[PDB]
């Protein structure tokens, strides 16, 4: 019970604005959700 997602789509225990990039690169193009800091394995998001 931390109530603070970690990893990409975050910033010091604070999720990034909805519609952010999840580490742009040629390894796996992804996006952020809006109310979380998780980077699913989907081709499209947000």
Curated annotation (Swiss-Prot):
Tree of life domain: Eukaryota
Transmembrane segments: none
Description of post-translational modifications: Two conformers are found, they may differ by their disulfide bond connectivities. Conformer 2 is 33 times less active than conformer 1. Conformer 2 may represent a non-native protein.
Disulfide bonds: 4-13, 9-32, 10-37, 22-39
Residue ranges of the motif Cell attachment site: 24-26
Tissue note: Expressed by the venom gland.
Location(s) in or outside the cell: Secreted
Function: Recombinant protein inhibits the adhesion of alpha-1/beta-1-K562 (ITGA1/ITGB1) cells to collagen IV with an IC(50) of 80 nM.
Further remarks about this protein from its record: Negative results: does not show inhibitory activity toward alpha-IIb/beta-3 (ITGA2B/ITGB3), alpha-V/beta-3 (ITGAV/ITGB3), alpha-2/beta-1 (ITGA2/ITGB1), alpha-5/beta-1 (ITGA5/ITGB1), alpha-4/beta-1 (ITGA4/ITGB1), alpha-6/beta-1 (ITGA6/ITGB1), and alpha-9/beta-1 (ITGA9/ITGB1).
Recorded family membership: Belongs to the disintegrin family. Short disintegrin subfamily.
Quaternary structure and interacting proteins, as annotated: Monomer.
Identification of the protein by name: Disintegrin jerdostatin
């Amino acid at each position: 019970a931390m109530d603070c997602t970690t990893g990409p789509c975050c910033r010091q225990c604070k999720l990034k604005p909805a519609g952010t990039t999840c580490w742009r690169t040629s390894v796996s193009s992804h996006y952020c959700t809006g109310r979380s800091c998780e980077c699913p394995s989907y081709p499209g998001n947000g």
